[PDB]
Write a protein that binds this ligand. Structure first.
Ligand SMILES: CC[C@H](C)[C@H]1O[C@]2(CC[C@@H]1C)C[C@@H]1C[C@@H](C/C=C(\C)[C@@H](O[C@H]3C[C@H](OC)[C@@H](O[C@H]4C[C@H](OC)[C@@H](O)[C@H](C)O4)[C@H](C)O3)[C@@H](C)/C=C\C=C3\CO[C@@H]4[C@H](O)C(C)=C[C@@H](C(=O)O1)[C@]34O)O2
Ligand SMILES: CC[C@H](C)[C@H]1O[C@]2(CC[C@@H]1C)C[C@@H]1C[C@@H](C/C=C(\C)[C@@H](O[C@H]3C[C@H](OC)[C@@H](O[C@H]4C[C@H](OC)[C@@H](O)[C@H](C)O4)[C@H](C)O3)[C@@H](C)/C=C\C=C3\CO[C@@H]4[C@H](O)C(C)=C[C@@H](C(=O)O1)[C@]34O)O2
Ligand SMILES: CC[C@H](C)[C@H]1O[C@]2(CC[C@@H]1C)C[C@@H]1C[C@@H](C/C=C(\C)[C@@H](O[C@H]3C[C@H](OC)[C@@H](O[C@H]4C[C@H](OC)[C@@H](O)[C@H](C)O4)[C@H](C)O3)[C@@H](C)/C=C\C=C3\CO[C@@H]4[C@H](O)C(C)=C[C@@H](C(=O)O1)[C@]34O)O2
Ligand SMILES: CCCCCCCC(=O)OC[C@H](COP(=O)(O)O[C@@H]1[C@H](O)[C@H](O)[C@@H](OP(=O)(O)O)[C@H](OP(=O)(O)O)[C@H]1O)OC(=O)CCCCCCC
Lengths: 362, 362, 362, 362, 362
């Protein structure tokens, strides 16, 4: 029978001794805050500035003794979010972030629900440009581990304690997909406490293990390099007397291998360690460069042939240099793709075992 | 005869018991909100970040019993938008969005119209960077279905219910055109209710079917690839003894096919499935590569010819290798464009039937 | 003798019955608002997102009967812009716009001048990213017509009427120049009234006719294409037996024509109609491709010559094929630039007459 | 002995008749405002959108008679910047600007100092994206004159007059350097008064003469073009019978000259007048194109030689065509670099005299 | 026993004489402020606009006598950051900065702690786009010294004095790494006082010495240039009669050296001094150009050979020109890589000694 306006100005009134600046149960045990997040959107992962953009529904549960009411019989009592000025919302800030803008569209995207015993549910929708450092030791295949850290500002560990939720940890939205990565099902909850000269502060973090998909990099980078190496193999069947043809074919394959290697590393930060694509493009470039060196040795042997022919064992030395120049081409035509196939299976199995070692060590 | 200032401070006065924080007909049936949007601008569709930018006139109709007035005889009573602080606007937020900024130019772009019985018309102009996931299984021709979701924050299904309008669904502005797409005439209205641990929330959505126009991709991508394949066909008429000419022509056609294929995929996200342009550029690249292989086989047969000529059935084996080397060119000159025409009609009709299957299944 | 503070708190005081929420002459004829704009900056015209950025001094003149004063003898009475909270500024918003931010530097850039009879002058400085659709049927030469629409939000046609000024329409700043376009001297004032389900709203618009300057596109695009076609003509004088030279020259001219055509269309939206540069680059590419086909026919005739010479009317058939192979080069050397000159004068006069037809139809 | 709180609420109190909306010495002579700016940062000069970014310390000095105090004996009395709401700051706005955001970091970056007789010192730190039109008649060497205009909004010339400072004009920070330009020591102070239909408004402007440094453009653009022309000269020493070598060398030099000319104009607005780099790249491209034409004439004369040799004064006509084909190469080998050196010294001295004429006319 | 609300409204109440506009110990000695910063994130260093982005925890310690309390026995008394409106926070602003936005996510990221004797701890989290000028005299290896200046606005040196902290200077976060640079362990604290016409202002600055990592630039830039020079060395073994082969190989190596040099300078400001990569690419380009000149001299000597052979000491002059043309190739094949190795060791040791001289002079 009681009207709701006096009831919802009674608990936050200045005739009441609420004092929203003062934390609950002052001069006592620390407040325990339970947090669960809901990943609404995850994406826009950029490697060159090492950050990613999430959309989260940050839900914070804490108990306030002064907020308890015994008049109304309903337990939930969902409230309007405009009177969220004097409730004592806890301070929370993300340790590694940029941006972090609120959503003010059509209303402030906020949820306030005060239970009968004093439990408060506080939900806010925020997009954060979270910055995570990434390791690029293996660029085509890799398991990145993005770190999201939630800690407090201005309340030490003896006054405010952040804890993860027990029923579930992180709720991902159904149907959420990433175009370039695959989000793993398990998520780590390791809370570490940062120490500062001012004091220690409560901090909880969650880790997402991101598997990079290998379907795009196989089409864009691995197959055109094989096309270039196969073309340099095609140069072996051409006639050895046709010098501009073989020289031009080999030179253009080396040039396009260099430009392809320079263009695949363009969308990447300037890291200072050797990656896997470096190894792949280096061995492919070495293969086309060795093909050009093989033709240069063949044409040098033919040069020695032509100088000793035109100005005495001349016939059998002509035979020896033509037979040797034919033997080099005949053994190269078999030896080049076989050693390339050997390198391919060795590289692929060692990266398969180091990828499985990364997924086993985690 | 009554002056308007007391009348428009009477209904929102604190001497009145309006209490704009409290929802209408509290502790009763849920409020029913009818929404229709007006697409003022639609465009700026970007594939690489999978989002689009709309300009909408969001109109929300709901009934308030406390707002009803019986003094004035006029039914419409358009009001000034500055006193839209205490009216109980309903909470609405878009589920998949970025940005969503209001228009504050020369006034707040808002409309408030309170009917005599209590019906409230609330119109706001907002630009939203709506994020939609897109399928790129067929890149040149495709029918994208952009999804716009409108749901509530902080009021469950038992307190707030969102419904679409019956007289029309979505009003598009007259003369509105898209440079890259064609907006279909019908629009789906399927409302789905999202479930969360806190509770269930009302949500309505509208789907726009976007037909990608095929006029640009025919000019930019399909015809230059045919030019490259026709040039590789031109290489068959050149003399077989002119080895640097045919080798250089074929090698430059393969190189430019590779760079054209790499440059057409630049304005696209790094997806991990095979698209239609992948198939097209792959078959065209296979055609120019097979032309280079055909010349390599011709010059290998001529090599065998020259070695058996210069160091016995020599005349008729010279005839056999010249006749075979002529026969390969003569059959290739007919066989290459005919099998290309067969591939063209097969690819085009299978993509026509899969495009019509996509438009029939919807 | 009267001090100014009471006089300027008398007309906007709450002891006065001003009521700035209520429109002037309520329950009567509609308010008539006269608007003239002053183009301070115009520029930053981008084709790929189809919008332009203006800086305008929006001046709005309307009459308020309650604001009239008879105490002071001065007629102008320029006022301070801080008390522009309660004046009843009219609602105005641009129909096709993005951005539209106010200038808050060192003060709010505003002007308020209330005349003695009640005329109010309201000037504000705003930069608007106005979005206009453009037609690219003729890309090098074209007359774009940018549309600026000013309409009201929340006041129908019976309550608020917008009208253009009679003394002048749009004042452009002296010395204002555009690097890529030429602003015409006349400007259209056609007011159209938009109709919505809620009601009809007053709207006035102004059109600027923008002539695209042809000096840059002649240097960047038209002359290098002529350089490529002239180089392909140079290929006719080279010796026909030198096959790698003529083949390589023609192939590189075709390749660079393709890359030049692909690079000139890069700063353009993905439109689906044929433009004028498409026609120009297509005919130039057809010319260099026909030159390569002409050399392929010459070397095929020489192939027939060489096969019938080396394995009977042999001398006179050698004469016939050498004379025909010389005649093809001799007639091509004259016939190629003459038909190119014919195409040039036909293309140029038809685009001159369609440009003058566009400027005559307007 | 008087406490400072009553003294600094006495002069701005509502029990005082200060009335900060009303300008000082109302209904009298115009207020005289003295302005000096301090260039803290100058840079980020972009040619393609024709604007530059400054950081200025805007100091405004004006006299207020009502602010005068005779109680305290100190003359300076530096005040706290939070009570800068009611002081009657003058209206000032920059005529050609974008952005112009204030600095709110750790405090509002403001200075308020009220002298004993009524002199007020008002300093604010602002970064402005000032838009200046630039002339690109000579692109490598040029003296740009950036214009910064400071005028008033809403106060005419009879009420507010802006004047420059007498002790100095513009203070540049010590150690301030520009990477691409050189700031001259003198600065023009020409005040021009803008006229509008509403009235005339006071305006003062300052001009900075910016000398473009020529060290970068000599390395990036002038020397690689000389490398290309020297390579085309190297083509003269190669054997005339080696036709693919000379043809390929000349064709690749023409192609790379075209791409170098197209790439140096990329970071520039689409202007419609001929610049100096246009002239330079055009003459260099003409030189490499004439070298290709010279080889085409040599090989045409050799063609006439070969046709009259193989199907009568045959020996002496063979002599005449070989001697003429040698004479063309021998005279070209001397004549090409000498005429290039003549063009170089003529171009360089005419641009030196037109640069000195620009610096003498100013 | 005293409740906290009256105690925390007593010290900031208007019944108290706090007067937060007035600085502490007015008309006396200057306030001494001790500042220490905590580098939370450091990165996003861009060379082309010469600025870097930090995340700092700015801690300011100063003593206020009026804030001292003797009632409560606790010494720390951490307070809520909402009542940081009237505390007299000191004015601080960074001298060389852009941006500098506060963090408003979930609360204002602020810390307020008032000691018992009057010591105030004020911590704020800010991201600043700090602009630092950089010297690019040596581009691959360099030690940049970023300067962060903190000074006051509106309080002179006699009223406000800024001092660095004695216990530590700048705290870097543990685990913080930079992908492109290495942050040195020592940091300079040199405070310089800026002088202005208005007065002198306190300023303290901190310098970070940044070592550029050399691992990326060795892979991206130094090794492909060696690949190009090694390929030009490979051109010496090819047959001298094969003129299109050697000419084409040398010409494409010169062309790709030019494009590689133009592409490595793309991500750099337009500086006007010679860098180290300029010297490296210039010597490598000189090496490949000299190889092309060596082949041109060889083919000129062979031209003289062919003209004196075909139209008398003819045999021994044929011997002299073939022996000399062989001797040039034989001495070049040894002389080119040896002088390249000499240049490599000289360049590397002189840059090692100038890098160590830069790290010794600091
Ligand atoms: C085979 C290599 C040699 C070099 C051949 O290369 C060329 C011609 C002939 C050579 C012998 C080169 C190559 C294509 C082939 C033709 C082969 C087919 C048409 C396709 O390929 C197959 C193989 C591919 O598994 C390696 C396989 O993918 C799976 C992987 C995943 O399941 C594990 C899954 O995601 C999904 C099921 O799909 C799939 C069956 O498709 C063709 C689609 C390959 C892509 C072509 C690419 C298009 O743009 C690329 C690039 O811009 C380059 C410049 C041109 C193309 C090219 O490089 O062309 C290109 O790389 O011709
Ligand atoms: C003549 C064409 C053939 C192909 C010739 O081309 C080449 C060499 C010889 C060939 C026979 C090609 C060409 C230049 C010429 C040399 C000609 C001159 C030096 C200039 O040209 C004249 C002609 C031009 O009117 C067509 C005329 O403009 C007027 C137009 C307007 O009044 C109506 C007005 O705005 C103003 C008065 O100026 C003007 C008198 O200048 C030279 C300045 C032309 C520009 C050169 C361009 C620089 O970058 C361009 C591009 O990056 C490309 C890659 C290289 C250059 C080129 O393409 O070089 C380039 O295009 O040599
Ligand atoms: C040796 C030079 C000649 C020209 C050879 O070049 C080619 C073939 C054969 C020529 C004789 C060229 C070159 C690679 C080699 C093959 C050599 C190996 C595969 C690798 O190299 C070694 C040498 C390198 O120390 C110079 C050394 O790095 C250390 C430095 C640091 O410790 C001090 C530390 O960070 C870490 C330990 O690693 C390391 C042991 O790896 C290979 C990984 C080199 C990188 C290849 C690059 C990939 O993209 C680049 C570029 O896009 C270009 C276009 C193609 C590649 C290339 O240019 O290919 C490329 O540059 O083949
Ligand atoms: C740093 C230079 C390294 C290469 C110089 C070291 C290479 C070099 O010494 O050349 C040998 C050769 C003379 O050979 P030789 O010593 O028998 O007399 O010189 C030339 O004639 C043209 C060279 C082109 C000279 C081009 C000069 C730019």
């Amino acid at each position: 029978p009681m009207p709701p306006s006096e009831f919802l100005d009674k608990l936050m009134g200045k005739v009441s001794g609420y004092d929203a600046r003062i934390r609950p149960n002052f001069k006592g045990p620390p407040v325990n805050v339970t947090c669960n997040i809901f990943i609404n959107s995850f994406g826009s992962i950029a490697e060159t500035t090492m950050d990613y953009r999430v959309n989260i529904f940050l839900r914070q549960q804490w108990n306030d003794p002064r907020l308890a009411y015994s008049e109304y019989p309903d337990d939930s009592l969902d409230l309007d979010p405009s009177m969220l000025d004097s409730i004592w919302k806890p301070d929370l800030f993300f340790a590694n972030e940029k941006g972090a803008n609120f959503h003010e569209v059509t209303t402030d995207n906020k949820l306030l629900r005060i239970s009968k015993n004093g439990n408060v549910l506080y939900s806010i929708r925020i997009t954060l440009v979270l910055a995570c450092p990434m390791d690029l030791k293996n660029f085509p295949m890799d398991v990145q581990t993005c770190i999201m850290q939630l800690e407090s500002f201005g309340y030490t560990m003896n006054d405010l304690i952040f804890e993860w939720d027990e029923k579930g940890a992180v709720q991902v939205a159904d149907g959420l997909t990433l175009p370039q990565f695959i989000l793993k099902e398990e998520k780590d909850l390791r809370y570490c406490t940062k120490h500062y000269n001012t004091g220690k502060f409560t901090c909880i973090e969650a880790r997402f293990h991101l598997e990079r998909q290998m379907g795009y990099y196989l089409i864009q980078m691995y197959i055109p390099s094989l096309l270039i190496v196969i073309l340099s193999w095609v140069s072996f069947w051409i006639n050895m007397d046709a010098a501009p043809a073989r020289v031009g074919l080999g030179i253009t394959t080396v040039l396009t291998m260099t430009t392809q290697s320079s263009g695949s590393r363009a969308s990447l930060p300037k890291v200072s360690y050797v990656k896997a694509i470096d190894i792949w493009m280096a061995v492919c470039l070495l293969f086309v460069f060795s093909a050009l060196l093989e033709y240069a040795a063949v044409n040098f042997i033919a040069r020695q042939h032509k100088e000793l022919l035109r100005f005495k064992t001349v016939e059998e030395m002509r035979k020896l240099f033509i037979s040797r120049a034919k033997r080099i081409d005949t053994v190269s035509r078999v030896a080049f793709p076989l050693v390339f196939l050997i390198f391919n299976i060795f590289y692929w199995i060692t990266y398969k075992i180091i990828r499985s070692e990364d997924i086993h060590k985690q």
